[PDB]
Amino acid sequence: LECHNQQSSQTPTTTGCSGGETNCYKKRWRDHRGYRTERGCGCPSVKNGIEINCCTTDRCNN
Amino acid sequence: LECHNQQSSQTPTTTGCSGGETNCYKKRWRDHRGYRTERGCGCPSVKNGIEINCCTTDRCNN
Ligand SMILES: [Cl-]
Ligand SMILES: [Cu+2]
Ligand SMILES: [Cu+2]
Ligand SMILES: [Cu+2]
Ligand SMILES: [Cu+2]
Ligand SMILES: [Cu+2]
Ligand SMILES: [Cu+2]
Ligand SMILES: [Cu+2]
Ligand SMILES: [Cu+2]
Ligand SMILES: [Cu+2]
Ligand SMILES: [Cu+2]
Ligand SMILES: [Cu+2]
Ligand SMILES: [Cu+2]
Ligand code: NA
Ligand code: NA
Numbered sequence: 852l853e854c855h856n857q858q859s860s861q862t863p864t865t866t867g868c869s870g871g872e873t874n875c876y877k878k879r880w881r882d883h884r885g886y887r888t889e890r891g892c893g894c895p896s897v898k899n900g901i902e903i904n905c906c907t908t909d910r911c912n913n
Numbered sequence: 914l915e916c917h918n919q920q921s922s923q924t925p926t927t928t929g930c931s932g933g934e935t936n937c938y939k940k941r942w943r944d945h946r947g948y949r950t951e952r953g954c955g956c957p958s959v960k961n962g963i964e965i966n967c968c969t970t971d972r973c974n975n
Contacts, residue, residue, distance in 0.1 A: 910949065
């Protein structure tokens, strides 16, 4: 599986994930005047005001 | 602007872009013995071995 890993609304970049990994993710939260966005391999558990989208196809976490 | 967002050869689906966006895109790349296609809002620049289409009208990125 390969996933995007760029931040914010940056031009897209991709990374390969560890063998068994089935998900890519996009986390979003707010800070002062805007959103923050984090993208990578996996689907880490979130809490306390973070939202996350997880998907299961290559480069899906746009 | 609205753009298609479906993958692959799926039936077309659409999303609404941010207010200032002017482009839609379709991106294709090779994945072993297959191809993957992504669609959405924006126009990432061409780079090695990706095929990129961009256009400027609603749902133009078939
Ligand atoms: Cl992509
Ligand atoms: Cu793949
Ligand atoms: Cu890419
Ligand atoms: Cu922060
Ligand atoms: Cu992508
Ligand atoms: Cu429109
Ligand atoms: Cu509209
Ligand atoms: Cu507009
Ligand atoms: Cu595909
Ligand atoms: Cu090149
Ligand atoms: Cu072509
Ligand atoms: Cu129309
Ligand atoms: Cu269409
Ligand atoms: Na449509
Ligand atoms: Na179409």
